CSV table of C-alpha atoms in Angstrom, one decimal:
chain,number,residue,atom,x,y,z
A,1,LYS,CA,173.4,205.3,133.2
A,2,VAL,CA,171.6,208.2,134.7
A,3,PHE,CA,167.7,207.2,134.8
A,4,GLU,CA,164.9,209.8,134.4
A,5,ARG,CA,162.3,209.8,137.2
A,6,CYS,CA,159.5,208.1,135.6
A,7,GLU,CA,161.5,205.7,133.6
A,8,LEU,CA,163.1,204.5,136.9
A,9,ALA,CA,159.6,204.2,138.4
A,10,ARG,CA,158.2,202.1,136.0
A,11,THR,CA,161.2,199.8,136.0
A,12,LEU,CA,161.0,199.3,139.7
A,13,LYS,CA,157.5,198.5,139.6
A,14,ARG,CA,158.2,195.8,136.7
A,15,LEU,CA,161.1,194.3,139.1
A,16,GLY,CA,158.4,193.9,141.8
A,17,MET,CA,159.6,196.7,144.4
A,18,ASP,CA,156.2,198.2,144.9
A,19,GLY,CA,155.3,197.0,148.4
A,20,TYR,CA,158.3,194.7,148.8
A,21,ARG,CA,158.4,194.0,152.7
A,22,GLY,CA,155.9,196.9,153.3
A,23,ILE,CA,158.0,199.6,151.3
A,24,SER,CA,156.0,201.7,148.8
A,25,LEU,CA,157.4,202.5,145.5
A,26,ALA,CA,157.6,206.2,146.4
A,27,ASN,CA,160.0,205.3,149.3
A,28,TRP,CA,162.5,203.3,146.9
A,29,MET,CA,162.4,206.3,144.6
A,30,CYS,CA,163.3,208.6,147.5
A,31,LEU,CA,166.0,206.4,148.5
A,32,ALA,CA,167.4,206.3,145.0
A,33,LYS,CA,167.2,210.0,144.4
A,34,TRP,CA,169.1,210.8,147.5
A,35,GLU,CA,171.6,207.8,147.6
A,36,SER,CA,172.9,208.2,143.8
A,37,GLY,CA,170.6,210.9,141.9
A,38,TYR,CA,169.3,207.8,139.8
A,39,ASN,CA,173.0,207.2,138.8
A,40,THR,CA,174.1,203.4,138.4
A,41,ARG,CA,177.6,204.1,138.3
A,42,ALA,CA,177.8,206.1,141.4
A,43,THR,CA,180.5,205.0,144.0
A,44,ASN,CA,181.6,206.3,147.4
A,45,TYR,CA,184.4,205.6,149.5
A,46,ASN,CA,184.1,205.4,153.2
A,47,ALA,CA,187.6,206.7,154.3
A,48,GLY,CA,186.8,206.0,158.0
A,49,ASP,CA,185.9,202.3,157.6
A,50,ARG,CA,187.5,201.6,154.2
A,51,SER,CA,184.3,200.3,152.8
A,52,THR,CA,182.5,201.6,149.5
A,53,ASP,CA,178.9,202.1,148.4
A,54,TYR,CA,177.9,201.0,144.9
A,55,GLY,CA,175.3,201.9,142.4
A,56,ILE,CA,171.8,203.3,142.3
A,57,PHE,CA,171.0,202.1,145.9
A,58,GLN,CA,174.7,202.6,147.2
A,59,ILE,CA,174.9,199.0,148.6
A,60,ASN,CA,177.8,198.7,151.1
A,61,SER,CA,180.9,196.3,150.4
A,62,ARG,CA,181.0,195.3,154.0
A,63,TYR,CA,177.8,193.4,154.2
A,64,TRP,CA,176.1,193.0,150.8
A,65,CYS,CA,178.6,192.8,147.9
A,66,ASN,CA,182.3,191.6,147.6
A,67,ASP,CA,185.0,193.9,146.3
A,68,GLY,CA,188.0,192.1,147.7
A,69,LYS,CA,189.6,195.1,149.3
A,70,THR,CA,186.9,195.7,152.3
A,71,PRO,CA,188.3,194.7,155.7
A,72,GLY,CA,186.3,192.0,157.3
A,73,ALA,CA,183.7,192.0,154.8
A,74,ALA,CA,180.8,189.8,154.1
A,75,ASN,CA,178.6,189.0,151.1
A,76,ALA,CA,175.0,188.7,152.2
A,77,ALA,CA,173.4,189.4,148.9
A,78,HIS,CA,176.1,187.2,147.2
A,79,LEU,CA,177.2,189.3,144.5
A,80,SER,CA,180.3,191.0,143.2
A,81,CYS,CA,180.1,194.6,143.7
A,82,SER,CA,181.0,195.0,140.1
A,83,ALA,CA,177.2,193.8,139.3
A,84,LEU,CA,176.0,196.8,140.9
A,85,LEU,CA,177.5,199.3,138.5
A,86,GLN,CA,175.7,197.9,135.2
A,87,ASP,CA,173.1,200.1,133.4
A,88,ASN,CA,170.8,197.1,133.8
A,89,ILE,CA,169.4,197.2,137.6
A,90,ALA,CA,168.2,193.7,138.0
A,91,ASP,CA,171.3,192.7,140.2
A,92,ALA,CA,171.0,195.9,142.2
A,93,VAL,CA,167.4,195.4,142.8
A,94,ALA,CA,167.9,191.8,144.2
A,95,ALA,CA,170.4,193.1,146.5
A,96,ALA,CA,168.4,195.9,147.8
A,97,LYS,CA,165.4,193.4,148.4
A,98,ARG,CA,168.2,191.3,150.5
A,99,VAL,CA,169.0,194.4,152.5
A,100,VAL,CA,165.6,195.1,153.6
A,101,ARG,CA,164.9,191.4,154.5
A,102,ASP,CA,166.9,192.1,157.7
A,103,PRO,CA,164.7,193.6,160.7
A,104,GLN,CA,165.9,197.2,160.0
A,105,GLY,CA,164.1,197.2,156.7
A,106,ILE,CA,164.5,200.5,154.5
A,107,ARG,CA,165.9,202.2,157.9
A,108,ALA,CA,169.3,200.4,157.0
A,109,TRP,CA,170.2,203.5,154.8
A,110,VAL,CA,170.6,206.5,157.0
A,111,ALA,CA,169.7,208.9,154.1
A,112,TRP,CA,166.3,207.5,154.2
A,113,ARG,CA,165.7,208.4,157.5
A,114,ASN,CA,167.0,212.0,157.0
A,115,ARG,CA,165.4,212.7,153.5
A,116,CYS,CA,162.5,210.5,153.3
A,117,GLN,CA,161.0,209.0,156.4
A,118,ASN,CA,157.8,210.7,158.0
A,119,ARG,CA,157.7,213.0,154.8
A,120,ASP,CA,155.4,213.5,151.7
A,121,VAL,CA,157.1,211.3,149.1
A,122,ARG,CA,154.4,211.3,146.5
A,123,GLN,CA,156.2,213.8,144.5
A,124,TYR,CA,158.6,211.1,143.5
A,125,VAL,CA,156.3,209.0,141.3
A,126,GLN,CA,153.6,211.7,140.4
A,127,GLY,CA,152.8,211.6,136.7
A,128,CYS,CA,154.7,208.3,136.0
A,129,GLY,CA,151.8,206.0,135.5
A,130,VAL,CA,152.7,203.7,138.3
């Protein structure tokens, strides 16, 4: 599923993402936009380390979900990576919450530093009613 901007904003709010571990809704929106373009079936293979990023938040198979083919992998969020490719993003949200529970926080995603950090991110939730 490819979410529309405000539709995603409201969904994330309903799922308790606004202010989770000090992370504003606008930041989570900025993250989803650059990671997948709000696309829940997005997948990206990392040839260099043989891991794959899954779903709307591009969650990595080496630490957060299990896909069986990732060398020396772990499953911190305790989920099959398959769960992160559904249209319903509840499992992807629970996984993202788990990721930011580690000290790095939202900084765990390099895309967030490059495109979101220290920027005006209001534009991502403007007009959505959240």
